[PDB]
Amino acid sequence: NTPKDQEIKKLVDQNFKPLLEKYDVPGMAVGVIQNNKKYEMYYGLQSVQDKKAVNSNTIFELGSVSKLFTATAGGYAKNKGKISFDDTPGKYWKELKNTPIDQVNLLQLATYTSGNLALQFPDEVQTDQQVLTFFKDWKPKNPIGEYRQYSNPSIGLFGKVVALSMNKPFDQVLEKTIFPALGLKHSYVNVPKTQMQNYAFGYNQENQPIRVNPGPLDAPAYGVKSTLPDMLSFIHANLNPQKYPTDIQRAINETHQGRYQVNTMYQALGWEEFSYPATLQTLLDSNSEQIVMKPNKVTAISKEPSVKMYHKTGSTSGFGTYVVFIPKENIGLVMLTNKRIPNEERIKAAYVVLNAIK
Numbered sequence: 001n002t003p004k005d006q007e008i009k010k011l012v013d014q015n016f017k018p019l020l021e022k023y024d025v026p027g028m029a030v031g032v033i034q035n036n037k038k039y040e041m042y043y044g045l046q047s048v049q050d051k052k053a054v055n056s057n058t059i060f061e062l063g064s065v066s067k068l069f070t071a072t073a074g075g076y077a078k079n080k081g082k083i084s085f086d087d088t089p090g091k092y093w094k095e096l097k098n099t100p101i102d103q104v105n106l107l108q109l110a111t112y113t114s115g116n117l118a119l120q121f122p123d124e125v126q127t128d129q130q131v132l133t134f135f136k137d138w139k140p141k142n143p144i145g146e147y148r149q150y151s152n153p154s155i156g157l158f159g160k161v162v163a164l165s166m167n168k169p170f171d172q173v174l175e176k177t178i179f180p181a182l183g184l185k186h187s188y189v190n191v192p193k194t195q196m197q198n199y200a201f202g203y204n205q206e207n208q209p210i211r212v213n214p215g216p217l218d219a220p221a222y223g224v225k226s227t228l229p230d231m232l233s234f235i236h237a238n239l240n241p242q243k244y245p246t247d248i249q250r251a252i253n254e255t256h257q258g259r260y261q262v263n264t265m266y267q268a269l270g271w272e273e274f275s276y277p278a279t280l281q282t283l284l285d286s287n288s289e290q291i292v293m294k295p296n297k298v299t300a301i302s303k304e305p306s307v308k309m310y311h312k313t314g315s316t317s318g319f320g321t322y323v324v325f326i327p328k329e330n331i332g333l334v335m336l337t338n339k340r341i342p343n344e345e346r347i348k349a350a351y352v353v354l355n356a357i358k
């Protein structure tokens with residue numbers, strides 16, 4: 001009657017494959033997981049100049065999807081009693097004790113509500129000392145906890161604090177503790193010399209080959225690299241947290257808890273959450289210029305839905321990512337590209353595929 005894998009391949013070919021020609025994207029990996037079966041589809045080239053095909057070993061930059069690993073590490077720490085989300089940063093980074101930023105709690109930092117932290121650090125902040133000084137010098141603007149402004153520094157600081165609580169630097173937290181707990185084998189903060197042959201180039205808007213630049217608190221905000229099989233395993237863990245040991249199970253479940261809303265989007269830890277079924281437009285609205293780039297007053301959750309879906313977009317200058325999962329249908333999807341394409345196109349292609357399967 002047509003086997004499931006060919007059916008999924010056809011749906012992906014209908015919806016994702018034409019994006020490659022349309023946006024001149026050299027390579028793409030799309031996976032679906034459904035009831036513990038994994039489907040992997042690969043297209044084009046990880047390196048144009050080397051004529052190297054995209055494949056199950058290709059390492060892609062996840063950009064802001066990296067925030068999901070940061071949130072997971074925070075969930076892991078918290079459920080191990082190493083932090084409380086009501087703590088402030090000065091408890092762990094002692095140089096911030098009794099400074100204005102120490103009036104902001106960990107949860108407000110992870111969910112972008114300090115009320116005065118912008119998308120990026122200033123370009124001049126690079127070293128560990130400059131990051132410290134930035135935070136010591138910080139002062140409040142909007143009332144703490146009431147306005148969401150999506151921010152690398154805000155969740156970067158959370159990440160740093162989480163690492164300090166676990167007595168390891170943040171790259172070691174992911175590479176030694178969190179990745180191995182999720183069973184991931186090819187995910188990295190720092191890609192080692194022996195895997196560089198698998199690290200795709202990203203491609204900028206003139207299709208020039210580029211990779212992410214080092215930056216302040218880059219790892220917790222946008223600095224993870226992974227493969228399609230790994231990303232499918234991560235979606236599998238979010239769909240089936242009960243199959244994992246206690247510590248990481250509780251961590252995953254902690255990332256799913258909604259904390260506030262901005263209209264139809266519930267801000268969980270890392271993940272954005274929606275009432276399921278969700279319309280396409282609700283998912284598109286989560287990624288509008290007004291939500292992503294500007295401050296928005298938040299609202300206490302006044303309807304908690306029974307059934308939810310979760311997504312997150314991510315980009316670096318040279319790469320695009322989108323992950324989405326729906327626990328009720330035990331289904332999820334990952335897209336990786338080595339050229340940014342509009343977030344709208346990622347969300348819609350994924351919407352059509354997930355809704356058509358079966």
Ligand SMILES: *[B]([O])([O])[C]([C]N1[C]=C(C([O])=O)N=N1)[N]C(=O)[C]C1=[C][C]=[C]S1
Nearest residue numbers: 063064065152221222313314315316317
């Ligand atoms: B994440 O991917 O949501 C995050 C935020 N962001 C900024 C941009 C942009 O400047 O167009 N796209 N996504 N990503 C990053 O901060 C990593 C990047 C740095 C520069 C371009 S993407």
